[PDB]
Design a protein around this ligand. Structure first.
Ligand SMILES: CCS(=O)(=O)Nc1ccc2c(c1)C(/C(=N/c1ccc(CN3CCCCC3)cc1)c1ccccc1)C(=O)N2
Lengths: 33, 271
């Protein structure tokens, strides 16, 4: 479908994951358990 | 603000993972497809894998390499812990090996160059993987190896290690013998892996754990006739009884058989 085609565009057009995700806060490890 | 499950559209399940199901999902704001591993807080605690999952997350979340499955972030709710992970479109490497029986030299060498590069990145950070085997590897859009599980991994800044861990056919002699071990256990496992890629079975395969232990500690390596001299040279240089004598990871990447056969391609990077 346009998922296979969506997966292909992700490979060729990488996003700035380090910024788009590596910047967002995350729960502390203590909180998790 | 951090992430919540409402930030994603769950497309479909991808299968069972370690202590949790994995689902293909798309993060809404970016319409970015990723895998979501879902763990139940109560199952974890009741299975005593709390101080185990933390280490796996603690290590995997800080590794950024094309051949290491990326953990983008993670979040939790009342009952679940969600890991936002890189989606590896081609799935399980072990399934591909099982389907083909054995890989040809090109495929094996490419995987070996990728593996060595990723393990070198880990070692430069004092991370020892300790459980390299086909089942812990996934494959990217273009078939690139992705180390995807870090269950036995350890950040070992100084002191040697004593824990026996890993998988039977992949254990280095030093673990079987109860000695301390260091990052060189990954060099041994890489040699077992190259052999299994090319042959379809690990080198010390035996009916009992005692006979396999025996074959490993005597490095009872018997090369099938169809292997090239180059692949045997590389395997023989990794599967050395003495850890100090094993070929370094940089050596695997520069080995002639790897250079002559690898068709490794680096994924496009952002910019
Ligand atoms: C190895 C870490 S784990 O927690 O055990 N599982 C894991 C971790 C992170 C993931 C994944 C799993 C996948 C993941 N990807 C995957 C990708 C594609 C498929 C569908 N087919 C499978 C046959 C080959 C073509 C693709 C199945 C799975 C997956 C989920 C569950 C079991 C095996 C493989 C992924 O893309 N990211």
């Amino acid at each position: 479908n346009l998922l296979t085609q969506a997966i292909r565009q992700q490979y060729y057009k990488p996003i700035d994951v380090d910024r788009m995700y590596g910047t967002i806060d995350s729960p502390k490890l203590e909180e998790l358990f | 603000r951090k992430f919540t499950i409402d930030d994603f559209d769950i497309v479909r399940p991808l299968g069972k993972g370690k202590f949790g199901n994995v689902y293909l999902a798309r993060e809404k704001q970016n319409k970015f497809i990723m895998a979501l591993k879902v763990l139940f807080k109560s199952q974890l605690e009741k299975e005593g894998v709390e101080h185990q999952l933390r280490r796996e997350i603690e290590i995997q979340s800080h590794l950024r390499h094309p051949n290491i499955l990326r953990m983008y972030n993670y979040f939790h709710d009342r009952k679940r812990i969600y890991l936002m992970l890189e989606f590896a479109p081609r799935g399980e490497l072990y399934k591909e090996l099982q389907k083909h029986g054995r890989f040809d030299e090109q495929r094996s060498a490419t995987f070996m160059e990728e593996l060595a590069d990723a393990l070198h990145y880990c070692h430069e950070r004092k991370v020892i993987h300790r459980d390299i085997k086909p089942e812990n590897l996934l494959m990217g859009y273009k078939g690139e190896l992705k180390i995807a599980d870090f269950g036995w991994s350890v950040h070992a800044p100084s002191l040697r290690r004593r824990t026996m861990c890993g998988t039977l056919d992949y254990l280095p002699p030093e673990m079987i013998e109860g000695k301390t071990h260091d990052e060189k256990v990954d060099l041994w496992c890489a040699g077992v892996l190259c052999y299994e890629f090319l042959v379809g079975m690990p080198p010390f395969d035996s009916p009992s754990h005692t006979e396999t232990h025996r074959r490993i500690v005597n490095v009872d390596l018997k090369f099938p006739p169809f292997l090239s001299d180059g692949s045997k040279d590389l395997i023989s240089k990794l599967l050395r009884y003495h850890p100090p004598q094993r070929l370094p990871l940089k050596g695997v990447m520069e080995h002639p058989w790897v250079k002559a056969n690898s068709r490794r391609v680096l994924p496009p990077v952002y910019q």
